[PDB]
């Protein structure tokens, strides 16, 4: 079975890591969250489409689904966790207690504020997770990537042809994901912020699915201006 | 002395709000009084058209000179350096601010910080915090590594240097090494000299595709 996990944990402020509900901001007179959800509703293959969000935003999430006539019976809103990977595992636990996990189940996890993913990206994620167990959506780095350990001087400039910008979806065989997460210590779980890095750290392969330049994360006013441009131009 | 090197090696001529991208970029450098010269390097076949479009937009600033570019980007930079050397000679304190012609949205702050950083530290790269997690792959099929995200930055331009430092670092490199490097700040790092970071902007994009031009029109109107 194929599950969707929409991660609506908000975008944390620089000072204090306060999560802000950027997914509720308006994009062409409709919240970003709704644009993203509409993309997943068009995929008939999902058994459930689960939005995980902080307790304090659950009521408003349901209200927004109602206001925009989102009635699909597959949609469910659950409480998120202490961090993004913990929230993914809250989704996994909900699946296990609700349907029970099948050996071939896969989950497609995706940022609520990435509304411009495409049918191709989702189908390719599903197929790669079914075949290989773990998938990351990426685009080739176009800018040069530089590293620094002090925010003052360059440490290294890696070979650009090997560098990629990570996007989402990130998709997994569910049992594989559970086993990988179970191998990590609490410390490892505290520092790790990316879901595919769980898999890499437990020494299992992660496939690449190519995303799109316009599969942007809408988190700043600049990003909202670009997102409005993307919509008006029919780009995505 | 402070020099500008505008890298136009014909995307720089696409129209943006009734003005070529190159002119948008150039106007930002013209507004900096402290440049001794603003040198645009372009391919031989594009030099006359470049001069003509400058004339069309009333750009007469005597500090602007259009010269022939090189066989790769860093070769073109060294062509600009050689032109300065053959014209004024190089002073020990001279710095050069090199910048993509197709990056019209750099700011006064970015240029001034590049100049001051070059004067103080000798070499500087304009960067922003990585917008996405960076992932590496050696086979274009599977992940090889996921580096520590807080250490990752997206490189932009300007890139700015003490001129003698750049010349001396480049002279130490091999023919294979010079051909393979495509970045100028990597010249300096590979020759074990420090490179300082100056913060860029999310909107300091390189305008090279129709998507980038749609984004650029949004940037301008807003």
Curated annotation (Swiss-Prot), chain A:
Keyword Cell cycle attributed: no
Family per similarity comment: Belongs to the IspD/TarI cytidylyltransferase family. TarI subfamily.
EC number: 2.7.7.40
GO MF annotations, alphabetized: 2-C-methyl-D-erythritol 4-phosphate cytidylyltransferase activity; D-ribitol-5-phosphate cytidylyltransferase activity
Organism phylogeny: Bacteria, Bacillati, Bacillota, Bacilli, Bacillales
Reaction(s) this enzyme catalyzes, per UniProt: D-ribitol 5-phosphate + CTP + H(+) = CDP-L-ribitol + diphosphate
Keywords, comma-separated and alphabetical: Cell wall biogenesis/degradation, Nucleotidyltransferase, Teichoic acid biosynthesis, Transferase
Protein name: Ribitol-5-phosphate cytidylyltransferase 1
EC class (word): transferase
Self-association and partners: Heterodimer together with TarJ.
InterPro entries assigned to the protein according to its UniProt record, in alphabetical order: IspD/TarI, IspD/TarI_cytidylyltransf_bact, ISPD_synthase_CS, Nucleotide-diphossugar_trans, TarI
Database matches in NCBIfam families: PRK00155.1-3 (NF001183), PRK13385.1 (NF009924)
